[PDB]
């Protein structure tokens, strides 16, 4: 054997074991989710409070690309940052040449091709993150999830990390119970609940909730963080549902 | 470009590629350097498994770097050409910028520096060659004899030998060479060099080369008959 020692090597199955090993690092990371809504998207993430010494609200994990795209990820945090830095370069060159801000499907392929490129050579390592991202463009709202292999699809709801199965189950219920659609303000509240429910799979350390959102009506198509009264309102909604 | 670090440290603190290059030197034909009061003599072994050779055109073992400095060697023959060429170029380059031919110490220091560079450069192996560099500095009558080796260390020697069975001939020179009184004449210096090679060589026919270097660019190679006379004289005195 030895097929798993080097990146870009096919095993006799037809598999790249190094990419599958990168997925294990993603599964080890904290939970993160994405919810598509009527006229936009909502992102949320679990931040484990390792110590009392962590400054609350001052270790931000959700990142913005351009002014209209939000990115969140689970796994190796530095690898996620590297991917977003590339995304920002890709989005900048698109806007430079074509004037219009980068469409979300166009942006999704730019990350996809870059991540896929890191499965082509043994001189590079695959990305140790699954990235949930999306936003609002001319054609409306889009939510995407990108994996270490370079594989991505569009999603109604997306989840990754240690509590992905709990979050996926909860997401599937929302899709069934709301066929006509879910509103932006509702999706923020649901996002909080799902993170709190998904925290049951990581319940040794208590956590800090962080939510962001893009919406054509609520945020005017731009990416913003949920803070203050709207954040506390979503936390209280989540606290009421667990009990 | 080929980048691989071939020369690297081992757990015990040794650079094996440099040490294995020394083994190639140990395999090479013997070379000896003896410096007298007013001269230096470079002696060289030539293995006698090769008959039907053409000695006119076959590369000589002792090479002129400039008109006043010579270089003999032990180890890989092909490797030695590269060092000799580089040294010859540096010799002319020194004349061009300093308006003065190289000192023997400077030329040695350059050659040694090249050998060292190949022990910590990527994509290259060390030179499988040790050299004996001998001559006289410009406007100077003090004889100079230096040694270099694959690692890049160099030093000055009253007399020295390198190559196969060099430890035997070094043993001979260590008792037969007096520091207080070196070989006073050319004949005495050549004889001691031939004597030292006769401990190792086999026959004193077309197996020994001798080159004598004197001050002010006075270098000459001895012929077969001239060398054979020393061999004949030494053997008759030995039977005693």
């Amino acid at each position: 054997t030895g097929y798993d020692l080097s990146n870009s090597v096919f095993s006799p199955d037809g598999r790249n074991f190094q990419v599958e090993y990168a997925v294990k690092a993603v599964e080890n990371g904290t939970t993160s989710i994405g919810i598509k809504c009527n006229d936009g998207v909502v992102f949320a993430v679990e931040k484990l409070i390792t110590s009392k010494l962590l400054v609350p609200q001052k270790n931000v994990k959700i990142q913005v690309v351009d002014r209209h795209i939000g990115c969140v990820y689970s796994g190796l945090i530095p690898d996620g940052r590297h991917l977003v830095n590339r995304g920002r370069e890709e989005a900048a060159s698109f806007k430079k040449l074509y004037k219009t801000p980068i469409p979300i499907p166009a942006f999704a392929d730019r990350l996809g091709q870059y991540v896929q490129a890191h499965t082509l050579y043994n001189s590079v390592r695959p990305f140790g993150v699954s990235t949930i991202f999306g936003g609002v463009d001319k054609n409306g709202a889009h939510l995407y999830m990108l994996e270490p292999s370079g594989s991505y699809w569009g999603y109604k709801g997306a989840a990754t990390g240690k509590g992905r199965q709990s979050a996926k189950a909860e997401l599937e219920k929302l899709v069934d119970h709301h066929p006509e659609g879910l509103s932006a303000r509702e999706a923020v509240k649901q996002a909080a609940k799902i993170i709190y429910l998904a925290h049951e799979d990581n319940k040794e350390k208590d956590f800090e909730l962080e939510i962001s959102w893009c919406s054509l009506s609520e945020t005017n198509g731009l990416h913003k963080f949920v803070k203050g009264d709207l954040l506390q309102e979503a936390i209280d909604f989540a606290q009421k549902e667990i009990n | 470009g080929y980048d691989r670090a071939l020369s690297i440290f081992s757990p015990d603190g040794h650079i094996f590629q440099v040490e294995y290059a020394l083994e190639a030197v140990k395999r090479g034909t013997c070379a000896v350097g003896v410096k007298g009061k007013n001269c230096v003599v470079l002696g060289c072994e030539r293995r006698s498994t090769l008959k039907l050779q053409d000695t006119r055109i076959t590369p000589s073992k002792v090479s002129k770097i400039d008109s006043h400095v010579v270089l003999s060697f032990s180890g890989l023959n092909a490797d030695s050409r590269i060092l000799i060429e580089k040294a010859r170029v540096e010799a002319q380059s020194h004349r061009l910028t300093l308006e003065d031919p190289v000192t023997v110490e400077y030329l040695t220091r350059y050659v040694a520096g090249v050998q060292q560079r190949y022990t910590q450069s990527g994509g290259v192996r060390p030179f499988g060659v040790s050299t004996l560099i001998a001559g006289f500095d410009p406007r100077d009558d003090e004889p100079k004899l230096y040694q270099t080796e694959p690692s890049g260390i160099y030093s000055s020697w009253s007399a020295q030998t390198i190559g196969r069975n060099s430890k035997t001939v070094r043993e001979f020179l260590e008792k037969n060479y007096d520091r207080k009184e070196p070989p006073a004449t050319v004949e005495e210096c050549v004889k001691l060099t031939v004597r030292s090679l006769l401990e190792v060589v086999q026959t004193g026919a077309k197996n020994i080369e001798i080159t004598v270097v004197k001050p002010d660019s006075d270098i000459v190679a001895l012929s077969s008959e001239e060398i054979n006379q020393y061999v004949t004289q030494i053997e008759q005195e030995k039977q005693e």
């Binding site: - | 770097i65 008109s67 060429e85 010859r88 170029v89 010799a91 002319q92 004349r95």
Partner: protein, 195 residues
């Protein structure tokens, strides 16, 4: 730099080169030797742009001396002249060309014949019985057309050369402070001290 002459006779090549080095309205030196020995039987005189001349001469000298050490053999005058021409032929299409004109006087030991080559800065080589660079030629060529014979001795060649220097000293506008004369023959290169 200015005056360099060459005369090939029966058994030798004679090169005469002016001693003056002028800059502006000042003769900075009056004992300058405008030549380099390339090999024991090959001499090159030079004249042209300041700095370029010596830099080029010494560069060629180094290369020929390197060849001599490598092969333990002296290159023929024909071979040296061809090497020099090629270097100038490269130079002329460079970013900054060597503006140097040269005469190469040599004695071929294999042929037992003297040889004189005239090469300009463009890389224009010609073998000649007598040669000159710069404005000198406008006087010396016609003079030598008349007085030169192919079977002359070295002493006859020196008298023929004295005739050229006298004419140049008479009709040239600039003071070139006399010449250094050198002879190239079977025994090598030597300088005439009293000219």
């Amino acid at each position: 730099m200015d005056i360099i002459l060459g005369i090939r006779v029966q058994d030798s090549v004679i090169l005469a080169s002016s001693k003056a080095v002028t800059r502006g309205i000042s003769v900075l030196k009056d004992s300058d030797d405008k030549t380099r020995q390339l090999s024991p039987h090959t001499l090159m005189s030079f004249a042209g742009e300041a700095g370029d001349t010596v830099q080029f001469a010494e560069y060629i000298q180094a290369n020929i001396q390197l060849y001599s050490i490598r092969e333990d053999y002296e290159l023929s005058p024909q071979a040296v002249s061809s090497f020099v021409r090629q270097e100038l032929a490269k130079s002329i299409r460079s970013r900054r060309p060597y503006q140097v004109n040269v005469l190469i006087g040599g004695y071929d030991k294999k042929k037992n014949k003297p040889e004189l080559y005239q090469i300009d800065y463009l890389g224009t080589k010609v073998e000649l019985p007598y040669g000159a660079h710069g404005y000198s030629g406008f006087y010396t060529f016609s003079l030598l057309d008349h007085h030169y014979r192919p079977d002359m001795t070295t002493e006859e060649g020196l008298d023929l050369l004295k005739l050229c220097v006298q004419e140049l000293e008479k009709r040239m506008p600039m003071d070139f402070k006399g010449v250094i004369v050198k002879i190239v023959d079977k025994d090598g290169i030597r300088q005439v001290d009293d000219f």
